[PDB]
Point group: D2
Chain length 439, copies 4
């Protein structure tokens, strides 16, 4: 029940200035056809069209009179400094805006007390900041009074505010937008979605996620080495994922080293987990367990709890697992806090520049997202009403099930054929050697 109206992104009234550098075009939400190939063109399975992001010929704000505002909120995420850098440099080099302000430590930065700390963003101040993790502005969780914030925006003459944060941040962003139009102030509030878990809807990718999976795989390589080094060794790795398991699932498949992958979308029992572990220890002396922070909220720190419960299980069963070892790893610090991969640096730069192009063109109350290889605008209202989750019947989760322990699979039948294939390889290698001597 998402309607075309839900996808209509707001514009501030008027586009009375030319673009210093450079029709709304659309892309289909679902590019799959209703009917088979035929004489006429195919029609979408969905009625939804998404507004494409692009530099416009006419823009709302007089560039040389425009102040741009930036705020970063919530958990850090690889790429924040890139988004800060790109918004700042696109503003200055392309549109030549009067001023760019950075609000310190999240929404607190726009409160009358934190407005003191706000920083001037020039070319010099952002030159290399993309080389470092975190945010030069700083970040806090938690809202402020939208009234008090819009006072600061009016006071500093801020014309556009970029809100870099999760669902909660944009929810607040739309409330600033509405508080602004309620006074009839000329303010654009534009969201750059920050979410390492890539669980934004009307999106296939958010900045930081690809970088985060790189680090997750590194964490798993370490866990794997620890675990295979012990007799009945268990590496438990916690891989982000508050409400979705996209990092857990991709890391599990990429690493090719996960035997059990625990995600919120597939909530199983403590007892079920231990029988997967038990089946792994039938024909293996090590087990790597990926666990999303959001798994087993009905069992909070699932990392420590799963580790304690695995230990308890192995201790109860010393009988069969005589010496055992269980190492817990929390690489959260290492996954959020790094600078982005080159690919994520480019993605961040592209999101930020299109964000400025569209905000200057008077877009407001929207996020910028990337979907079907294209950059789209999405109203915050819809963006924050629905969220993304693993499809347990889809290709990614199928690849997790192919690698992870499955109680279905005949373990010892599967192993018979394994051996026959290996003998067939050995016996050929055996003869080719024999040949070389006499020959």
């Amino acid at each position: 029940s998402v309607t075309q109206e839900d996808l209509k992104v707001d514009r501030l009234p008027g586009a009375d200035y030319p673009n210093p550098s450079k029709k709304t075009d659309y892309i289909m939400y679902n590019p799959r056809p209703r009917d088979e190939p035929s004489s006429e063109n195919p029609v979408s399975v969905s009625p939804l069209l998404c507004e494409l992001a692009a530099a416009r010929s006419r823009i709302h704000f007089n560039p040389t009179e425009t102040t741009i505002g930036i705020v970063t909120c919530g958990g850090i995420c690889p790429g924040l400094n890139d988004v800060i850098r790109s918004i700042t440099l696109t503003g200055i080099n392309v549109y030549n805006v009067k001023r760019v302000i950075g609000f310190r430590f999240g929404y607190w930065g726009l409160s009358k007390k934190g407005s003191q700390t706000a920083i001037e963003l020039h070319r010099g101040r952002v030159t290399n900041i993309h080389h470092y993790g975190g945010t030069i502005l700083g970040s806090s969780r938690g809202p402020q009074d939208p009234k008090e914030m819009v006072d600061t925006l009016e006071r500093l003459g801020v014309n556009i505010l970029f809100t870099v944060g999760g669902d909660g941040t944009q929810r607040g962003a739309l409330v600033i937008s509405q508080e602004a139009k309620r006074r009839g102030v000329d303010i654009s509030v534009f969201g750059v979605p920050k979410t390492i878990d890539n669980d934004l809807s009307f999106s296939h990718r958010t900045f930081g996620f690809q970088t985060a999976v790189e680090k997750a795989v590194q964490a798993i390589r370490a866990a794997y080495a620890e675990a295979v080094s012990a007799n009945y060794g268990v590496g438990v790795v916690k891989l982000m994922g508050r409400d979705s398991g996209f990092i857990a699932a991709q890391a599990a498949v990429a690493s090719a080293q996960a035997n059990i992958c625990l995600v919120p979308e597939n909530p199983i029992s403590e007892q079920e987990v231990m029988s997967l572990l038990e089946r792994r220890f039938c024909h293996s002396r090590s087990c790597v367990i990926i666990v999303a922070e959001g798994f087993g909220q009905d069992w909070i720190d699932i990392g420590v709890i799963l580790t304690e419960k695995v230990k308890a299980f192995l201790k109860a069963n010393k009988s069969r697992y005589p010496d055992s070892t269980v190492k817990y790893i929390d690489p959260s610090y290492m996954i959020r806090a790094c600078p982005p991969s080159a690919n994520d640096a480019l993605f961040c730069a592209t999101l930020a520049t299109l964000a400025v192009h569209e905000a200057m063109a008077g877009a407001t109350g929207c996020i910028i997202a990337m979907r079907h290889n294209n950059y789209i605008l999405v109203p915050i209202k819809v963006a924050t009403s629905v969220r993304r989750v693993l499809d347990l019947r889809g290709q990614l989760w199928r690849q997790v099930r192919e690698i992870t322990v499955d109680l279905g699979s005949d373990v010892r039948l599967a192993r018979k054929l394994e051996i026959r294939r290996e003998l067939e390889a050995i016996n050929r290698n055996r003869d080719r050697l024999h040949e070389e001597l006499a020959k």
Copy 2:
């Protein structure tokens, strides 16, 4: 001239019969162009294009009896980060999912299937592929050049190979469909299925090929080094050659990602030696360093090649890397007048970009392409490649795939980002510089006061 892709061109071949169940359902499609003809209205939107692409997926009925099927793998041409992943995934998907009788790896490209190289061919089991994705190159090995299709299909028949995966560029797949035709010519049950290898990401009906994301990571590293060398010298010039035989996707993305390129030379934008030197000259107006990205395919009109081909059917190119470096030196030497001491370092990181293991993102992509390749080949697909487009995996007949290629849009967002960073002759040098200073003073004088405040 317009290309003439028709829906018939996109219909991928199937070997006749799907008479066995899947150990582990109609063809679904995705629209080639998901942009609508008309604005939002009462009815659902309709594609600007009539073309539909076949989606890749595991099928319920399959052509080959899994337990009786031999899978063959061959890797051809320049190495590319991910080849071992594709080898590993084809091997493990075959064994763990379909439980195929045997998997053969053909050594050193098509040479591996010639009666001479068929000696060297290797048995691929789980043990033999366990960790091969951790290393660059190909455990099979790779050569440029075709062999006698007759002699190759002899080997395929001799070893009872039922599917052959061809991992290589346009030339390799062109040969793949020639194996397919030589096979049907004898009425043998063979699938020939392509996994596109091209680091330049210039396959059409594709937004991404395996290895490209990894290659851009390395290019940016090469640039970071060049940048350090160049900024260290007074009138220092780093020239970096970044792959790109016929397209500049690596050059362009590396240039934007690095944010350290001042001149980015790609084949799509052929400019003169004289134009390049005036970009350099303008850089040295208000800077003592310049980094120059150059695609191996740029400036094919700057010199004349021998006129020959390498064995794969690529033009033997004029080493534009060495030539651009010599011409920059010549220019700086002619103008010692204004560039009194100058330094020009040339860097060729080709070795480092192809030869590395894949990024985790490229490991996943390779693994996904390879498994869908096996799912579809088992379902009797043949004479096609697997590609990724609009976030989805599609099948494409080799015939169309090898008749069109991909190239930078000089009016598109990526190239716009290159032009925002690289030197622009347009902006009036010394006016442009006045405002630069005023902005920097305005920053300094604020920093100046905020300090003063803290004391009193």
Copy 3:
């Protein structure tokens, strides 16, 4: 209570007889005569100033130098080599396994090489079943991966039962890769062996990431471990500077010494408090360092060694660990919560990168070091050395009897250059906070105002 190490204590045992020539190092390849033991001075500092006579060591001790010998004890083609890895993994174990295996096979051409699985358990009659054959194929690339292909356990086994296995498999040399506890057991295997008059060499390759072996300036894995520590700190630093009154607590190995903590702290240049066992301070002292940091900064990074503050059952029924990382984090939180007054919003992130520091493959420099230690270990064990470790000291490879090696341990000198560099970077209650800060500013203004004018110059002219 002084240590009582005499020159006799540094004489390393040799099994009686060196009755075979060296396959690789021929006696006729040298310039000078005699295949004797050469020595290096324990302490190369002189008693007296420069004078007419040569200088004399401040110490009487000489250490035996490690090197390939012209005569060897074991008949190479009849020799079985045994390898066992014990305790915490450490970057480089697979290199040491690989190098011992390949030096044995390629240089001496030994009959066979056995890998004992999961520590000393591998030599017990039960674990002797699991022992692996080590050939060229089985070790080709194992140095590319962290951990140990043999596996590792803590804990001793019955020396009697172990030497049964060594005799049963015809093992002539056993390399013991492990910490102090492992070598202590190694010497006990050696003595149990000589007690039956079996022809066995027991030779230690010291494993200790903390680099706290004595008669040593470097153990394999330590350089790699400091690389990872600095990476962990970069992350903690980013988390911390991102929060208003942000605190990164990083635990950096160091059971009984703080060499990783100290080097990481200096290298990173990002540590404001560095807590090592050698400098035991109070909870109250720590909080006043933090307090002084928050006078003129909104972030603090705290390095803490596992072994710091030893004087400071989980729900599932297991005994809960000595974990200064969790405790320091709780106590910092408690302090910040008591003082919300002045630190209104605060954040404390704890990082335990132990997993990431031990479990990685070695740096190229540590790969070389591992390869060198392992090959000299084989050269010397073949030359009949036993009851000793191989160590690296004053840029040279030496042999040390296990007895001495396990009676003394290494520790930070709090008056030495490394710890001085930590004190220069970390918060110091000495420097008067607000005067120190005045001059900071004046220096920055003096820089700004010059930059300011040089710009002004360019414009109109």
Copy 4:
């Protein structure tokens, strides 16, 4: 060989009339800590009469800290760590000694000429904060001398009291000439060398800054060459690994990588014909060959990198007969080895060298370098330091490890190969039975 204790006596400027703001006689370390006689009841005596002055912070210092200007110049090829040395000299000066001012001279000795003295930079805490995170030198670097007269004019003009010269043998040679020109006019100047040489060929040294980082990169270059080469039938990777006059990088990289089959260093000059017979022997029972070559090898040949590659190609052409398809890839990773930031171990080493350099220069040391030898930091007069150089011992343990890995013309090809096979069969046939057992 003929080096005297007088040669090792390091100069001090007359007077140490001020206390140390942070923190006493000269201590020494034995040049050669090997004993003359066997172990005995008394302490052993050095084989050598030579003692080196140990570097350390002193209680009395020559320069009045608050009146002292420090000068820094970086010369010749960049080297991983230059920015660390710049940073540490600057911060040790400011934070420990509290010096009046610190100047950075741009683009080498040219920076001190009356023309380049214009470009010289003021170095404060802000200007050096993160410069160690980047390769190259924020000061810049040129080769070549300037008029020592003209340079000492600049030093007098800017009131420079200490000048740190970061560069190779040629740079320090010039440094001592500045020192002598300074004392020749009544100028209170310390000239103190921080040796820069990636090849680690400084004498009275076991390690120079950048060398450990450079070997890390060399091994990475080799891993790439190896992958290219093993991918081709009769594949040849030629890698050039620095080494103008010594092969320490070539040798360590070769051993560390374990992937070099031929390692060509200046210390072991062999013929083109000798190289090709190593290659020939490799291709008897192998289809790939990796060749490490130091830039200083074969200066008596036909840019040894391009020439060796051409000569290998020429050899493979019309031996097509036996090497039917062949491939020869040349790699020059010089750019990548010099231009990177230092390893954490090299960052620490750089920081340590720079701080001790300031401690000792403040204590009036001059006409000397700081070096690291037998795990200790020593001072060495430039005069001796630049009169002798370091090179591979072909009879030492490092080169022995290169010979163990690289192809050896000694071992009888076909007999050597028989035993290879027997060992492999003995492995295969055991693996073969253990499998059979399970069925």
